């Protein structure tokens, strides 16, 4: 056989080229599940159903037709509630003055006297002007 070859005469015989793998993507698989916050489907259902009305209410009247007794209803009630839930959503005590127990008034004073009181009754003469009788009017 070959006595005087060798490889590094040359080339060689060219091995493998190796240093790679094939890999699959599952594709479909497990992920995000949403955090949408605020309030329920409910208030959603709220705002949707009360834009509903409000559309019907461009077209209906526009066409000279009217809301049904049903969703005019449920939609009024929504935005009461709405209303009431954006503006406090609570029951402030409106601006009271005094509870009142064991405050009894009443009118203070004696009724009617013959009398001023105080001072009066205590000079000798008397207070006016001086000397008065009607006028020379008589009476204005």
Known sequence: GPLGSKDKDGEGAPP??????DQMEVDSGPGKRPLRGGFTDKERQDHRRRKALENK????SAGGKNLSKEEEE???RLT??????????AGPPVGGVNPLEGG???APGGGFVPNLQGVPE??????????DIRG?????
Do not use: Y
Not at 136 to 140: S, T
């Open 80 to 89: 009461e509630e709405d209303e009431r839930r954006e503006r406090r959503v």
């Open 136 to 140: 020379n009017q008589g009476f204005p």
């Open 74 to 76: 449920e939609l009024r």
């Open 104 to 106: 009894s008034r009443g």
């Open 57 to 60: 209410k461009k077209q209906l």
């Open 122 to 131: 205590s000079p000798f003469s008397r207070t006016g002007e001086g000397l």
């Open 16 to 21: 493998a080229k190796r240093a790679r793998t």
